[PDB]
């Protein structure tokens, strides 16, 4: 079961670049593509994210997309830049100017066809393609605009494959432009309709974790992206490493998504790292469900968990893992829906992440995620009610009504997340 | 408490102990519902492409 | 922290037990339909026992013993006696009783008329009584056709009437002893040291149904002398025991309680192999209310057993705490009872 | 005669792999299929030939068919120790599993492979002078075990309308769960299989898990521990078919002795004794001790309380050093203490069967070798508890239509849910009408 990776935009390629830099190490793949590990478990499922080449070389099944050549030149010049397939670099020149319209309708349109040719070529060499995973931000123009355009076009051609995304939400605390709510609202509507699984990565959460928890006075995008790498490694562990659960993207969606539109997951990770003391199983569980370890900036206690999937990594007592997991459910039983039995799933992997002996990653379909969409919606209306900055989008051919629709679709999503909270 | 039908063999024996007396569809019908499900599955798909065409 | 749910709002006893558990600060009340509980205060009718003991890492307890209806219903009690060797047909403390089905509707009609004609031809007192589980409808008559036609006019039962009841001289009235029994998950039989006497207010007349029925509702409704002698027509053991000493020159422990403790043990040991939850995936406890009646020779009789009793106002505090102490905290850690030892 | 075993889904394949392992040990068949005991190489009308065909080279080949929409589980049978037993034509695999979706295993991914499975089944059916029926191993909760099984039961009922069909079903348990939509699949597959299965043996994974923990002292039972225990019970039930005897000698007799009402065809199995092989030496239980254990809920394959449920039939299947007189004395003494209330329209009696050969165990397993063991098959109304538990979980998710879109997206209609559930409510009504006091 192969997965095709796609990274779009500055944020999409920079977090995506780190993702490959991380798992490549976890599987023992050097920057040249040669395997230099010890455990065969590293290679039992290497085909999921890597294609084997001549001379036992492992090339990521990744596609790098951007309307500017800047962020992709850095990737090629980065640590693991020589490992990516050269043909899979697809870039434009004019850029998207942090404009959703430019990425979705005008400048991305010129480039989108070329990308699908690479996607098609990768899918053709997949014995059993299970789906695609995209990394991008919703606040910019390329990853947001063009990224959703690709998702829409990929669905038209692979309607029976799972569409997964790691979607970085904008935040005024970490902001590049005031039109980020416009771009994010337009993108959210697309994700609601055309994805099965969206990992909501809120830059507000990443910032607070770097500032409050990790005690970094001035977080940099690199600091926030270290958090994203740890999470992306955690939520792909069951895919990348063998287990008794034969995990795949379709199974995750069937069990995590009770309603097709409510597929926006709150990811959490423990222990938060920027360090020699090992962490016990109860410590992982407590921190994992703690709001200070959530990557979405929502209070879980303000909502209810529809479904939860937790992954513990390292050598530990699986019996103890149960003892502490069931404890949380039985303690905070009010924060889990009572009408979905056995809505908490736990898996264990003996292989720990690089640098830690014990770790735990958490995937939560919580109705508290409505707080995030409400935050975006408020920021969106605050500008739209005065049509502020709309000329950047109407100049690219869009009409006001398309905003009013995305606004309504956003407010509707919040209402849907609310009805299931009672 | 009456043992009855004491059958015995080399590999075993069996008996009964009374303690108190007393006081499908056809192949076509299958294919009909099966093919009918793929029709709804292909119609729901066609609607998706029609929606994406818009 | 411990988890419990509530599904019986009309329970005046466990409305108090729910109060105390929360007051400890170590117990939490969830919603009635939450499957993850450590304890259930389930409803009277249709308690879903089949769904209990199936939650991983969750020791579940319930305040009702499944299958206890065989002892807390009129028809099943009489059928339990006789058919049970322990509670033989020759049960000295159980009033002679027979199960009667209405004609519109096994049945024991011809057997009732058998032991009736013997008393008429033997010059013996032949007064009987009929009642049912659908009561607030009772009839006391010396004839046969009158009681059986009243039955035709659900499953009823007819038993012999205590035509010679023990009467308290300060009034010449009839009392009714209520003893509270608690059976925990270990099937230890705990009797509450404090009981009540729903005394009457009118003089018993062996020739009207107010001086014959001693329910607190009848005394508060039909009787006018409510509260003349004792408060609320409910005497306690301390007052009663003193009257036994001054009048009959005996005590409550010997002339009455010895029999009461025997009747309690016999009934619960009889159905122990049918309701015991020792090797079961869930545990059960339950509070019972035994109603007795004492005759003039100081002999205790068994009237009925209630599965959902209501405790006296004074003794709510002392009792409902005892429920938590021995039934709820015995399995979920955070004397006023007499343990009836047995095997 | 002959019996064809069919193993569907992950649980069916793994449990079947454990059963045929135990059959080989009990029949002395080597992992290369060579049975030295057999002196009729190539032929043999013996009793064990009902489950094993004989090749010209003298190889005892199981009369089995393993099916799974995904190839990972059956590949271990192909590279396992007993790989030589089967030929590849019996091991059928797909590419994509059903993703725990009944609709995906019945309407979409199942319909692609049903025709092939039936042909492979016919390849064995034609090797049978008289075919008795089929033994179907599968899980309620799995997408393939529920969806594809029900489809096959519909088709077998057409192509083999005379042959009987017995079921070994794994009732879902949260302790070893695999998906949250398992209740949906368990209800859909029971509704679509009820009219086709002649008798079904439910195994609650909760019972096996607890039994492994308490009696075998295994902190975290694996599927291996569960399957090795389950195969012991399956062996007791199928022993009468594979060894000479007179009780339950053909598949139709299970229906006669245990299934008076066709829809109430879910006998409750109880096994004893389960002893930890870690124990150096255990106090070997007596005939009366193991018989009494048949009435302890902790030893039942489905957690329920037979006291509050009337019996309709009861078979005792002893295995080992057991003599009829011991059995009768145990039955008489257990009547007095226990409360065994049959229905008024059935005799209060027990059909007993003894096989002198002691229960076999796998070398290096967890089950100690015992000198006498018993498996009780009692068709008691108390097993309706499991249907109620399963039905309540169904009503909780379906009230909000949770996860339903996944099924309708494969072709299913929302109505088929209420149809399947209303059938389950009817089954719970039938159990009550038979168990009223
Ligand atoms: N006793 C036992 N139960 C099992 C075993 N394997 C899976 N199960 C149970 O089966 C249920 C899931 O069904 P599976 O058989 O794994 O699924 P499947 O038949 O492969 O169908 P798919 O969803 O397409 O994979 C869960 O409730 C598990 O507890 C096993 O080996 N032994
Ligand atoms: N055999 C008998 N002899 C004399 N009096 C009898 C009797 N059977 C019943 N009684 C009288 O009938 C009264 C009420 O009977 P019973 O106990 O059936 O009523 P009930 O069900 O309302 C009691 P509770 O309020 O405790 O549930 C008793 O208090 C007693 O005075
Ligand atoms: N976490 C993270 N967020 C980023 C990064 N770069 C930009 N962002 C965020 O994404 C939005 C800008 O999007 P950007 O990726 O530059 O848009 P694009 O280049 O046109 O696709 C803002 O909300 C930024 O805070 C990055 O490297 N990491
Ligand atoms: C790759 O992503 C993952 C996939 C899976 S799975 O393929 O086994 O899907 C399942 C199966 C059963 C389930 N029950 C519930 C409540 C959720 C759930 C589920 F998601 C499990 C993962 O961790 C537990 C996981 O995390 C990284
Ligand atoms: Ca032979
Ligand atoms: Ca049939
Ligand atoms: Mg930028
Ligand atoms: Mg009353
Ligand atoms: Mg599978």
JSON list of C-alpha atoms in Angstrom, two decimals, chain A residues 174-317:
[
{"chain": "A", "resi": 174, "resn": "UNK", "atom": "CA", "xyz": [2.52, 34.12, 13.62]},
{"chain": "A", "resi": 175, "resn": "UNK", "atom": "CA", "xyz": [1.34, 36.14, 10.62]},
{"chain": "A", "resi": 176, "resn": "UNK", "atom": "CA", "xyz": [2.76, 37.06, 7.22]},
{"chain": "A", "resi": 177, "resn": "UNK", "atom": "CA", "xyz": [-0.21, 39.02, 5.83]},
{"chain": "A", "resi": 178, "resn": "UNK", "atom": "CA", "xyz": [-3.59, 40.35, 6.92]},
{"chain": "A", "resi": 179, "resn": "UNK", "atom": "CA", "xyz": [-5.42, 38.36, 4.21]},
{"chain": "A", "resi": 180, "resn": "UNK", "atom": "CA", "xyz": [-4.62, 35.06, 5.92]},
{"chain": "A", "resi": 181, "resn": "UNK", "atom": "CA", "xyz": [-8.23, 34.61, 7.17]},
{"chain": "A", "resi": 182, "resn": "UNK", "atom": "CA", "xyz": [-9.49, 35.11, 3.60]},
{"chain": "A", "resi": 183, "resn": "UNK", "atom": "CA", "xyz": [-7.13, 32.43, 2.30]},
{"chain": "A", "resi": 184, "resn": "UNK", "atom": "CA", "xyz": [-7.85, 30.04, 5.17]},
{"chain": "A", "resi": 185, "resn": "UNK", "atom": "CA", "xyz": [-11.64, 30.31, 4.94]},
{"chain": "A", "resi": 186, "resn": "UNK", "atom": "CA", "xyz": [-11.64, 29.64, 1.19]},
{"chain": "A", "resi": 187, "resn": "UNK", "atom": "CA", "xyz": [-9.37, 26.63, 1.74]},
{"chain": "A", "resi": 188, "resn": "UNK", "atom": "CA", "xyz": [-11.37, 25.17, 4.63]},
{"chain": "A", "resi": 189, "resn": "UNK", "atom": "CA", "xyz": [-14.43, 24.89, 2.40]},
{"chain": "A", "resi": 190, "resn": "UNK", "atom": "CA", "xyz": [-12.37, 22.89, -0.08]},
{"chain": "A", "resi": 191, "resn": "UNK", "atom": "CA", "xyz": [-11.02, 20.57, 2.63]},
{"chain": "A", "resi": 192, "resn": "UNK", "atom": "CA", "xyz": [-14.51, 19.96, 4.03]},
{"chain": "A", "resi": 193, "resn": "UNK", "atom": "CA", "xyz": [-15.65, 18.62, 0.65]},
{"chain": "A", "resi": 194, "resn": "UNK", "atom": "CA", "xyz": [-12.53, 16.95, -0.77]},
{"chain": "A", "resi": 195, "resn": "UNK", "atom": "CA", "xyz": [-10.52, 15.36, 2.08]},
{"chain": "A", "resi": 196, "resn": "UNK", "atom": "CA", "xyz": [-10.98, 12.30, 4.26]},
{"chain": "A", "resi": 197, "resn": "UNK", "atom": "CA", "xyz": [-8.43, 13.24, 6.93]},
{"chain": "A", "resi": 198, "resn": "UNK", "atom": "CA", "xyz": [-7.10, 16.71, 7.76]},
{"chain": "A", "resi": 199, "resn": "UNK", "atom": "CA", "xyz": [-4.60, 17.15, 10.58]},
{"chain": "A", "resi": 200, "resn": "UNK", "atom": "CA", "xyz": [-5.26, 20.65, 11.92]},
{"chain": "A", "resi": 201, "resn": "UNK", "atom": "CA", "xyz": [-1.88, 22.21, 12.74]},
{"chain": "A", "resi": 202, "resn": "UNK", "atom": "CA", "xyz": [-2.50, 25.62, 14.32]},
{"chain": "A", "resi": 203, "resn": "UNK", "atom": "CA", "xyz": [0.45, 28.01, 14.31]},
{"chain": "A", "resi": 204, "resn": "UNK", "atom": "CA", "xyz": [-1.09, 29.64, 17.38]},
{"chain": "A", "resi": 205, "resn": "UNK", "atom": "CA", "xyz": [-0.63, 26.38, 19.29]},
{"chain": "A", "resi": 206, "resn": "UNK", "atom": "CA", "xyz": [2.88, 25.81, 17.95]},
{"chain": "A", "resi": 207, "resn": "UNK", "atom": "CA", "xyz": [3.83, 29.32, 19.06]},
{"chain": "A", "resi": 208, "resn": "UNK", "atom": "CA", "xyz": [2.38, 29.03, 22.56]},
{"chain": "A", "resi": 209, "resn": "UNK", "atom": "CA", "xyz": [4.04, 25.64, 23.06]},
{"chain": "A", "resi": 210, "resn": "UNK", "atom": "CA", "xyz": [7.38, 27.13, 22.01]},
{"chain": "A", "resi": 211, "resn": "UNK", "atom": "CA", "xyz": [6.81, 30.19, 24.19]},
{"chain": "A", "resi": 212, "resn": "UNK", "atom": "CA", "xyz": [5.05, 28.90, 27.31]},
{"chain": "A", "resi": 213, "resn": "UNK", "atom": "CA", "xyz": [6.09, 25.25, 27.54]},
{"chain": "A", "resi": 214, "resn": "UNK", "atom": "CA", "xyz": [9.49, 25.06, 25.83]},
{"chain": "A", "resi": 215, "resn": "UNK", "atom": "CA", "xyz": [10.44, 28.51, 27.20]},
{"chain": "A", "resi": 216, "resn": "UNK", "atom": "CA", "xyz": [11.62, 30.01, 23.90]},
{"chain": "A", "resi": 217, "resn": "UNK", "atom": "CA", "xyz": [11.28, 33.79, 24.10]},
{"chain": "A", "resi": 218, "resn": "UNK", "atom": "CA", "xyz": [11.38, 34.27, 20.31]},
{"chain": "A", "resi": 219, "resn": "UNK", "atom": "CA", "xyz": [10.24, 31.15, 18.44]},
{"chain": "A", "resi": 220, "resn": "UNK", "atom": "CA", "xyz": [11.34, 30.87, 14.83]},
{"chain": "A", "resi": 221, "resn": "UNK", "atom": "CA", "xyz": [9.61, 28.94, 12.06]},
{"chain": "A", "resi": 222, "resn": "UNK", "atom": "CA", "xyz": [12.29, 26.30, 12.55]},
{"chain": "A", "resi": 223, "resn": "UNK", "atom": "CA", "xyz": [11.25, 25.99, 16.19]},
{"chain": "A", "resi": 224, "resn": "UNK", "atom": "CA", "xyz": [7.59, 25.56, 15.20]},
{"chain": "A", "resi": 225, "resn": "UNK", "atom": "CA", "xyz": [8.54, 23.05, 12.49]},
{"chain": "A", "resi": 226, "resn": "UNK", "atom": "CA", "xyz": [10.40, 20.84, 14.97]},
{"chain": "A", "resi": 227, "resn": "UNK", "atom": "CA", "xyz": [7.00, 20.36, 16.62]},
{"chain": "A", "resi": 228, "resn": "UNK", "atom": "CA", "xyz": [5.39, 19.55, 13.27]},
{"chain": "A", "resi": 229, "resn": "UNK", "atom": "CA", "xyz": [8.08, 16.98, 12.45]},
{"chain": "A", "resi": 230, "resn": "UNK", "atom": "CA", "xyz": [7.56, 15.17, 15.75]},
{"chain": "A", "resi": 231, "resn": "UNK", "atom": "CA", "xyz": [3.81, 15.03, 15.11]},
{"chain": "A", "resi": 232, "resn": "UNK", "atom": "CA", "xyz": [4.07, 13.98, 11.46]},
{"chain": "A", "resi": 233, "resn": "UNK", "atom": "CA", "xyz": [6.39, 11.17, 12.52]},
{"chain": "A", "resi": 234, "resn": "UNK", "atom": "CA", "xyz": [3.93, 10.15, 15.22]},
{"chain": "A", "resi": 235, "resn": "UNK", "atom": "CA", "xyz": [0.78, 10.02, 13.09]},
{"chain": "A", "resi": 236, "resn": "UNK", "atom": "CA", "xyz": [2.56, 8.04, 10.35]},
{"chain": "A", "resi": 237, "resn": "UNK", "atom": "CA", "xyz": [4.18, 5.51, 12.71]},
{"chain": "A", "resi": 238, "resn": "UNK", "atom": "CA", "xyz": [1.48, 2.89, 12.17]},
{"chain": "A", "resi": 239, "resn": "UNK", "atom": "CA", "xyz": [1.83, 3.33, 8.41]},
{"chain": "A", "resi": 240, "resn": "UNK", "atom": "CA", "xyz": [5.64, 3.23, 8.36]},
{"chain": "A", "resi": 241, "resn": "UNK", "atom": "CA", "xyz": [6.28, 0.47, 10.88]},
{"chain": "A", "resi": 242, "resn": "UNK", "atom": "CA", "xyz": [4.77, -3.03, 11.12]},
{"chain": "A", "resi": 243, "resn": "UNK", "atom": "CA", "xyz": [2.19, -3.78, 13.78]},
{"chain": "A", "resi": 244, "resn": "UNK", "atom": "CA", "xyz": [-0.68, -6.12, 14.59]},
{"chain": "A", "resi": 245, "resn": "UNK", "atom": "CA", "xyz": [-3.18, -3.50, 13.35]},
{"chain": "A", "resi": 246, "resn": "UNK", "atom": "CA", "xyz": [-2.26, -3.45, 9.62]},
{"chain": "A", "resi": 247, "resn": "UNK", "atom": "CA", "xyz": [-3.02, 0.26, 9.67]},
{"chain": "A", "resi": 248, "resn": "UNK", "atom": "CA", "xyz": [-3.85, 2.12, 6.46]},
{"chain": "A", "resi": 249, "resn": "UNK", "atom": "CA", "xyz": [-5.37, 5.47, 5.58]},
{"chain": "A", "resi": 250, "resn": "UNK", "atom": "CA", "xyz": [-8.80, 4.04, 4.75]},
{"chain": "A", "resi": 251, "resn": "UNK", "atom": "CA", "xyz": [-9.10, 2.26, 8.10]},
{"chain": "A", "resi": 252, "resn": "UNK", "atom": "CA", "xyz": [-8.17, 5.46, 9.95]},
{"chain": "A", "resi": 253, "resn": "UNK", "atom": "CA", "xyz": [-10.92, 7.40, 8.17]},
{"chain": "A", "resi": 254, "resn": "UNK", "atom": "CA", "xyz": [-13.62, 4.77, 8.67]},
{"chain": "A", "resi": 255, "resn": "UNK", "atom": "CA", "xyz": [-12.98, 4.61, 12.41]},
{"chain": "A", "resi": 256, "resn": "UNK", "atom": "CA", "xyz": [-12.15, 8.28, 13.06]},
{"chain": "A", "resi": 257, "resn": "UNK", "atom": "CA", "xyz": [-14.77, 10.05, 10.92]},
{"chain": "A", "resi": 258, "resn": "UNK", "atom": "CA", "xyz": [-18.36, 9.36, 12.05]},
{"chain": "A", "resi": 259, "resn": "UNK", "atom": "CA", "xyz": [-19.69, 12.10, 9.75]},
{"chain": "A", "resi": 260, "resn": "UNK", "atom": "CA", "xyz": [-18.08, 12.93, 6.40]},
{"chain": "A", "resi": 261, "resn": "UNK", "atom": "CA", "xyz": [-17.57, 16.65, 7.06]},
{"chain": "A", "resi": 262, "resn": "UNK", "atom": "CA", "xyz": [-16.22, 16.27, 10.62]},
{"chain": "A", "resi": 263, "resn": "UNK", "atom": "CA", "xyz": [-12.82, 14.88, 9.65]},
{"chain": "A", "resi": 264, "resn": "UNK", "atom": "CA", "xyz": [-10.58, 17.58, 11.16]},
{"chain": "A", "resi": 265, "resn": "UNK", "atom": "CA", "xyz": [-8.28, 16.01, 13.75]},
{"chain": "A", "resi": 266, "resn": "UNK", "atom": "CA", "xyz": [-6.60, 17.60, 16.76]},
{"chain": "A", "resi": 267, "resn": "UNK", "atom": "CA", "xyz": [-3.05, 16.19, 16.92]},
{"chain": "A", "resi": 268, "resn": "UNK", "atom": "CA", "xyz": [-1.14, 15.95, 20.17]},
{"chain": "A", "resi": 269, "resn": "UNK", "atom": "CA", "xyz": [2.32, 14.79, 21.14]},
{"chain": "A", "resi": 270, "resn": "UNK", "atom": "CA", "xyz": [4.27, 14.03, 24.31]},
{"chain": "A", "resi": 271, "resn": "UNK", "atom": "CA", "xyz": [6.86, 14.70, 25.63]},
{"chain": "A", "resi": 272, "resn": "UNK", "atom": "CA", "xyz": [7.29, 18.21, 24.21]},
{"chain": "A", "resi": 273, "resn": "UNK", "atom": "CA", "xyz": [10.95, 18.65, 23.26]},
{"chain": "A", "resi": 274, "resn": "UNK", "atom": "CA", "xyz": [13.18, 21.41, 21.90]},
{"chain": "A", "resi": 275, "resn": "UNK", "atom": "CA", "xyz": [15.87, 15.91, 28.15]},
{"chain": "A", "resi": 276, "resn": "UNK", "atom": "CA", "xyz": [17.74, 12.90, 29.56]},
{"chain": "A", "resi": 277, "resn": "UNK", "atom": "CA", "xyz": [15.10, 11.65, 32.02]},
{"chain": "A", "resi": 278, "resn": "UNK", "atom": "CA", "xyz": [12.95, 8.84, 30.69]},
{"chain": "A", "resi": 279, "resn": "UNK", "atom": "CA", "xyz": [9.19, 9.39, 30.85]},
{"chain": "A", "resi": 280, "resn": "UNK", "atom": "CA", "xyz": [6.87, 6.85, 32.46]},
{"chain": "A", "resi": 281, "resn": "UNK", "atom": "CA", "xyz": [3.71, 5.52, 30.83]},
{"chain": "A", "resi": 282, "resn": "UNK", "atom": "CA", "xyz": [1.35, 7.51, 33.12]},
{"chain": "A", "resi": 283, "resn": "UNK", "atom": "CA", "xyz": [3.37, 10.66, 32.40]},
{"chain": "A", "resi": 284, "resn": "UNK", "atom": "CA", "xyz": [2.96, 10.21, 28.64]},
{"chain": "A", "resi": 285, "resn": "UNK", "atom": "CA", "xyz": [-0.79, 9.67, 28.94]},
{"chain": "A", "resi": 286, "resn": "UNK", "atom": "CA", "xyz": [-1.38, 12.69, 31.17]},
{"chain": "A", "resi": 287, "resn": "UNK", "atom": "CA", "xyz": [0.69, 15.07, 29.03]},
{"chain": "A", "resi": 288, "resn": "UNK", "atom": "CA", "xyz": [-0.72, 13.63, 25.81]},
{"chain": "A", "resi": 289, "resn": "UNK", "atom": "CA", "xyz": [-4.32, 14.51, 26.68]},
{"chain": "A", "resi": 290, "resn": "UNK", "atom": "CA", "xyz": [-3.23, 17.78, 28.31]},
{"chain": "A", "resi": 291, "resn": "UNK", "atom": "CA", "xyz": [-4.31, 20.81, 26.28]},
{"chain": "A", "resi": 292, "resn": "UNK", "atom": "CA", "xyz": [-0.76, 22.20, 26.51]},
{"chain": "A", "resi": 293, "resn": "UNK", "atom": "CA", "xyz": [0.39, 19.36, 24.21]},
{"chain": "A", "resi": 294, "resn": "UNK", "atom": "CA", "xyz": [-2.30, 19.93, 21.56]},
{"chain": "A", "resi": 295, "resn": "UNK", "atom": "CA", "xyz": [-1.22, 21.37, 18.22]},
{"chain": "A", "resi": 296, "resn": "UNK", "atom": "CA", "xyz": [-4.56, 23.03, 17.37]},
{"chain": "A", "resi": 297, "resn": "UNK", "atom": "CA", "xyz": [-5.15, 25.68, 20.08]},
{"chain": "A", "resi": 298, "resn": "UNK", "atom": "CA", "xyz": [-8.48, 24.33, 21.29]},
{"chain": "A", "resi": 299, "resn": "UNK", "atom": "CA", "xyz": [-9.50, 23.39, 24.81]},
{"chain": "A", "resi": 300, "resn": "UNK", "atom": "CA", "xyz": [-10.59, 19.73, 24.68]},
{"chain": "A", "resi": 301, "resn": "UNK", "atom": "CA", "xyz": [-12.62, 20.28, 27.87]},
{"chain": "A", "resi": 302, "resn": "UNK", "atom": "CA", "xyz": [-14.74, 22.85, 26.00]},
{"chain": "A", "resi": 303, "resn": "UNK", "atom": "CA", "xyz": [-15.80, 20.04, 23.65]},
{"chain": "A", "resi": 304, "resn": "UNK", "atom": "CA", "xyz": [-16.21, 16.28, 23.36]},
{"chain": "A", "resi": 305, "resn": "UNK", "atom": "CA", "xyz": [-14.05, 13.65, 21.69]},
{"chain": "A", "resi": 306, "resn": "UNK", "atom": "CA", "xyz": [-15.96, 11.83, 18.96]},
{"chain": "A", "resi": 307, "resn": "UNK", "atom": "CA", "xyz": [-13.08, 9.40, 18.39]},
{"chain": "A", "resi": 308, "resn": "UNK", "atom": "CA", "xyz": [-9.45, 9.14, 19.53]},
{"chain": "A", "resi": 309, "resn": "UNK", "atom": "CA", "xyz": [-6.41, 7.21, 18.27]},
{"chain": "A", "resi": 310, "resn": "UNK", "atom": "CA", "xyz": [-3.23, 7.12, 20.35]},
{"chain": "A", "resi": 311, "resn": "UNK", "atom": "CA", "xyz": [0.20, 5.74, 19.44]},
{"chain": "A", "resi": 312, "resn": "UNK", "atom": "CA", "xyz": [2.82, 4.95, 22.09]},
{"chain": "A", "resi": 313, "resn": "UNK", "atom": "CA", "xyz": [6.42, 4.42, 20.95]},
{"chain": "A", "resi": 314, "resn": "UNK", "atom": "CA", "xyz": [9.24, 2.62, 22.75]},
{"chain": "A", "resi": 315, "resn": "UNK", "atom": "CA", "xyz": [9.78, -0.31, 25.07]},
{"chain": "A", "resi": 316, "resn": "UNK", "atom": "CA", "xyz": [7.04, -0.16, 27.70]},
{"chain": "A", "resi": 317, "resn": "UNK", "atom": "CA", "xyz": [4.46, -2.28, 29.50]}
]
